[PDB]
Amino acid sequence: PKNPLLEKRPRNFGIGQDIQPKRNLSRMV
Amino acid sequence: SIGAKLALVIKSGKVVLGYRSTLKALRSGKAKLILIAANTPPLRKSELEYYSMMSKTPVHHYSGTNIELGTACGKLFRCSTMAILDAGDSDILAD
Amino acid sequence: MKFLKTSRVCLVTRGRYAGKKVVIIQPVDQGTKSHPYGHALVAGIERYPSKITRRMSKARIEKRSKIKPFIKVINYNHLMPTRYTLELEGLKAVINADTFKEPSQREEAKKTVKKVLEDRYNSGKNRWFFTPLRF
Amino acid sequence: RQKMEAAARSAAEAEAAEARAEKP
Amino acid sequence: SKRTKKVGISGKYGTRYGASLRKLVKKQEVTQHARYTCTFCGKNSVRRTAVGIWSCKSCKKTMAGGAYTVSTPAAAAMRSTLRRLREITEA
RNA sequence: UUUUUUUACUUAUUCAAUGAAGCGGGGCUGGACUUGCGUCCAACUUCUGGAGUUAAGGUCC
RNA sequence: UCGUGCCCCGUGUGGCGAAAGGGAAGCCGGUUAAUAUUCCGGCACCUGGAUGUGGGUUUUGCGCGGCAACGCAACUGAACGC
Ligand SMILES: [Zn+2]
């Protein structure tokens, strides 16, 4: 059995929402 | 029409004019109606709406300013929010 | 109707515990001689349990799931009541008016509140009460 | 074991409470 | 007790600058020094701090406005046609 | 094969912006028209002078 | 530990330029032919460093009190931010 205190906190990466993740920016280096 | 109903409540019923007395009425749970002026700050408006939702009190958004709401109550001072505790002989509650 | 009853969850807005979540143990609407205004006897969380991730050890989880409670006489004007309720049988009459007149009674009451709140938190229920407010 | 039993009792109580709620 | 017949607030300028110029400046000085009713809190405490900048002493709101009046008629009419265009676009 | 006219293009050259961050083309989903399935157009935050950062989690080891 | 690697971050670039701008901290008494907030005497302060003692906190681990404004000799707080 898993711990009931463990929580999922999804991030929304739409415009105006949460900070963008670190993507591969090698095309624009 | 709401001005005429308000004048009838001032003449016959019981009201409290002002933010702190309105909050005290909502906490007591004997408030029958809440009137919120148009130019009330949005934070205070949201607080009053939350209090009225928790006490199950109807809310009327008065389209005038606090100056107009005080004039409608018949006072020479502004009023951003007010509570009707007793309707009196008016039908302001039936809406 | 009235909403400031027993098991009502509120937010403290003034004082040292501003921003903390409390549960109303006892409402005193007509006030007393010491506090001649509508007030409440409440119990709340001073230090929230820390966040628990899936790779923590059992000892670290047990360390981070500790709750520091507090008890308070608080004015109604310094509370922001919420639609949430928290019903705990172990907190029934855990504090009263003369609890706050003796430091050892406060300590025993805080021990009881800590035990009951930690049982409820370990149950996994009422997660909104045990997460801190962000402001 | 006692901690788990206390947590289970508190969860059962919470579920039952939710069921019953649903001039000087 | 009225102290001057016609100069009003322009009486500080004495006999200088010409009657028409003093009369022209008088309107702007009266409107730029008058107190206005705040649209946010309803108190009569809005006053100019700089040109185009009007602040309320009570609720501490600062508003971008006209040079010598709180609002300009062009901006009021512009707000009206903006509301009309927004209603047309939404409907 | 060459001379004029316009009429496209991009690789020289020129200008601007940025912490060189999301360009171009597909896929997925939804909506419109169309032919009876090709286009174009959209994904994502609007009552509030709050907060937003050290990945939570899923699944194989 | 496939041991001779991997990860995070973005903000740019240095120096000179004020004995009236900004700025850590010293007062009183006495003393010489001539110096003194600089010398002598008394009484202090600032900055930085090391490491003790007392006191505090903690077996409800990181203080308690006041409705509140806030108080009290203490009373953890890196990155990154306001
Ligand atoms: Zn104002």
Instruction: Find how far residue A14's CA is from the centre of its chain.
Output: 11
Q: Which helix (H) or strand (E) holds C112?
A: helix C103-123
Look up residue A2 and give its two tokens: 């898993």
**If we measure between CA atoms, which residue out of B19, B35, B21 comes closest to residue B87?**
B35
Q: Which residues of C63-72 are buried (b: 16+ CB within 10 A; e: fewer)?
A: eebebebbbb
Do the Cβ atoms of B35 and B82 come closer than 8 Å?
yes
Inter-chain touch C4–B56, beta carbons under 8 Å = no
Q: Which of residues 1-29 of A touch C (CB under 8 A)?
A: 2-7
Q: Which two tokens stand for residue C72?
A: 């308070």
Q: How far apart are CA C64 and CA D18, in angstroms?
A: 28
Distance CA B26, CA B18 (A): 12
- Resolution in angstroms, to 1 decimal, for this deposition? 2.2
Per the structure block, which two tokens stand in for B83? 């509570």
Nearest CA-CA partner of C83 in C135, C21, C34: C21
Find out whether C121 and C67 touch, Cβ atoms under 8 Å.
yes
Structure token digits, residue E61: 């709101």
Are the CB atoms for C109 and C99 separated by under 8 Å?
yes
H runs (alpha helix) in chain D = 2-21
DSSP result, chain E: ----SS-GGGGGGTT-S-HHHHHHHHHHHHHHHS-B--TTT--S-EEEEETTEEEETTT--EEE--SSSSS-HHHHHHHHHHHHHHHHHH-
Residue C90, CB, strand G, below 7 Å: no
Query: What would the two tokens of residue D8 be?
Result: 């289970």
Tell me how far apart the alpha carbons of residues A13 and B32 are, in angstroms, rounded to a whole number.
Answer: 45
Determine which helix (DSSP H) or strand (DSSP E) holds C25, and give its type and residue range.
Answer: strand C21-28
Torsion over CA: C32, C36, C40, C43 (sign): negative
Amino acid at E61: K
Chain A contact for C93 (CB, 8 A cutoff) = no
A5 touches strand F (CB under 7 A): no
- Ligand 1 center–CA B91 separation, angstroms: 35
- E31 touches E25 (CB < 8 A): no
Question: Could you give the CA distance from residue C41 to residue C8 in angstroms, rounded to a whole number?
Answer: 11
Cα(C127) to ligand 1 centroid in Å equals: 41
Yes or no, beta carbons of C54 and A3 under 8 Å apart: yes
> Which two structure tokens, joined as six digits, stand for C5?
């009853």
Tell me the residues surrounding ligand 1 (ion) with CB < 5 Å: E 38, 40-41, 56, 58-59
Quote the CA–CA distance of E86 and E81 in Å, as a whole number. Answer: 8
Is C73 near strand G, with its CB below 7 A from some atom of it?
yes
How many residues does this entry show for chain A? Answer: 29
Contacts of C62 (CB under 8 A, 6+ apart): none
Residues C94, C109 contacting (CB under 8 angstroms): yes
Exp. method: cryo-EM
Residue (of C126, C51, C118, C60) closest to C87 by Cα position = C126
DSSP state of C27: E
User: In B24-80, at which residue ranges do the beta strands (DSSP E only) sit?
Assistant: 33-37, 59-62
Helix, coil or strand: residue B85 = strand
Count of CB contacts below 8 A, C vs D? 31
Nearest to C131 by CA among C47, C69, C71, C58: C47
**B46 interface with C at CB cutoff 8 Å:** no
Instruction: Report the candidate in C82, C16, C77, C12 with the shortest Cα–Cα distance to residue C42.
Output: C12
Phi, psi angles (nearest 5°) of residue C125: -90, 165
- Cβ contact C39 with chain G strand, < 7 A: yes
* Neighbouring-strand partners of residue C71: C43
Q: D20 is written with which tokens?
A: 């019953």
Distance separating alpha carbons of residues C113 and E9, to the nearest angstrom? 71
**B51 contacts: CB under 8 Å, gap ≥ 6:** B23, B26, B27, B57, C81
Q: Is E39 at the interface with chain B, CB within 8 A?
A: yes
**Which tokens hold the place of C132?**
């801190």
Residue E36 backbone class (left: φ over 0; alpha: ψ -120 to 50; beta: rest): beta
